Amino acid sequence: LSTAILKQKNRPNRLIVDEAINEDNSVVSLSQPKMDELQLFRGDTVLLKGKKRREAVCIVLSDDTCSDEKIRMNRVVRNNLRVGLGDVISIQPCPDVKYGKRIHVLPIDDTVEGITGNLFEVYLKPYFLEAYRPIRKGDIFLVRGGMRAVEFKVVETDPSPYCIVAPDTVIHCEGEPIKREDEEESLNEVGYDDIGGCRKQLAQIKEMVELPLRHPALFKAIGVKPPRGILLYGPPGTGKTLIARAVANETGAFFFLINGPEIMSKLAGESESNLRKAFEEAEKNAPAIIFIDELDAIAPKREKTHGEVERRIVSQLLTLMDGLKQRAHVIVMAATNRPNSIDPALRRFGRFDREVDIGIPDATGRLEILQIHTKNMKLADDVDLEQVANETHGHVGADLAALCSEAALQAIRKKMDLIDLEDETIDAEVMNSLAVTMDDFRWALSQSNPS
């Protein structure tokens, strides 16, 4: 009823992802009635939108085994859009695309051990030649070259974000191999799907932050000024920083992060300077979000704080907050676990005058969190997460994450005699048999702890 903003809404161009029959990295398939509905001719360059602000440029073709409201794409495209089979995606016409001038690609390290020969000659040239491939900056793509398959990242493009790779396009693969861990920590990146039992609050954040920045016209038309300071509060480990990361990755707005301790660690004056630089940067760049994490570190009650520099910072912040005129289109978000220790001046009208309580999860919420945490864990049949959700009365997300870590450590302990600390590598069979059992969770539960 209030939650209405979160609802997906059906559109002509909003389609479900199905497995591809055409296994090319550049190709997406649609049913013929759907192509006509969207005025898409065969072989047109299209823009697809996935989760966490991710995009891919593809060339569209007609398929008959494909349903009307479905789209077919391989793993490579699904990866780039950070989507799995069943997720909804946007499809957009894209006749804007320039022919590429210069691109910069690099291989992923672990998929490149043994023989250089020539990476461009063996792999990239046969992949691109006369194919007129659309590629986007940040794409990870797989190429076979007789022997095996190498993954490459698009690091740079000379036409702004995306281009067509013509014979003209100079293909550079100069630098060091891109580290596996870099790109896995890039897949790691937090989205709204990684945040559990916070539906009501996520809806509030989209209302107060996302809505007025993407559609200022609504608030201006109705005759209402958008609130400009939103403060997330709640007990330690409920998900504030996690939401911070999610927003950063999920928004159309330019995002600027400030960590409380990161500011207070700096020299006298050089801290006030970074604060100004943050606000000046946000004002300069588009509709923007400034996230002040751990606000109580920078803005405690001016009455009860010893240092002159510490008092000067609170004053610096207040001045910045009021320094933004309406037409700046900058919203300031902040998170704390002790809201009662922040200077009341900052919680006045026009400053942080809106509050979102990220509280303790209910039984239902805990279940969401356990499902979110265990999505990469190997679990057994007998593991009942609903059971674990109910037995965790005082637990917040951080306690549940830790519980999952200790359940997993127990399963490692059960496999100990087949493992030793001294050998270089762990046995292959032992690695595959690793499942976290219900019994492990009951051991984790017996050890667990509140607040």
For 29, which DSSP code? E
In three-state secondary structure terms, 124 is helix
* Single residue of 236, 307, 323, 394 touching ligand AGS by CB under 6 A: 236
Tell the smallest beta-carbon distance from residue 412 to a second copy (Å): 6
Smaller CB distance to ligand AGS: residue 242 or 258?
A: 242
Binding of Mg ion by 374 (CB under 5 A): no
Return the residues of window 323-382 that contact ligand AGS according to CB under 6 A: 337, 348-349, 369, 372
In the complex with a second copy, the residue whose CB is nearer, 157 or 251, is 251
Task: Give all strands (DSSP E) within 215-283, no chain letters.
Answer: 229-233, 254-259
Q: Least CB distance from residue 291 to a second copy, whole Å?
A: 14
| Residue 71 binding target from a second copy, ligand AGS, Mg ion, none, CB below 5 to 8 Å by type | none
307: tokens are 């240092």
**Count of beta carbons in the 10 Å neighbourhood of residue 152:** 24
| E-only strand ranges, 181-259 | 229-233, 254-259
CB 244 within 8 A of CB 348: no
> Which position among 197, 212, 229, 287 is part of the footprint of ligand AGS (CB under 6 A)?
197
**Binding piece for ligand AGS, criterion CB under 6 A, among 39-47, 138-146, 194-202, 406-414:** 194-202
Residue 392 is assigned to a ligand binding site: no
| Spatial distance between the Cα atoms of 276 and 323, rounded to a whole number of angstroms | 11
Task: Give the nearer residue to Mg ion in terms of CB position, either 293 or 440.
Answer: 293
Residue 431 contact partner, candidates ligand AGS, a second copy, Mg ion, none, CB within 5 to 8 A by sort of partner = a second copy
Q: Is 413 in the site for ligand AGS (CB under 6 A)?
A: no
Cα–Cα distance measured from residue 197 to residue 199, given in angstroms and rounded to the nearest whole number: 6
* Among 22-30, 120-128, 158-166, 240-248, the segment contacting Mg ion (CB under 5 A): 240-248
- φ, ψ dihedrals at 293, nearest 5°: -80, 140
Binding segment (CB under 5 A) for Mg ion, from list 195-203, 236-244, 324-332, 395-403: 236-244
* Bridging pattern class, strands 288-293 and 254-259: parallel
CB nearer a second copy, residue 93 or residue 126: 93
Instruction: Return the one option of Mg ion, a second copy, ligand AGS, none that residue 378 interacts with (CB less than 5 to 8 A, by type).
Output: a second copy
419 touches 426 (CB < 8 A): yes
Contact 290, 282 (CB under 8 A): yes
Return phi, psi of residue 291, to 5°.
-110, 110
Annotated binding site: 236-242, 337, 373
Q: Which residues bind Mg ion (CB under 5 A)?
A: 240-241
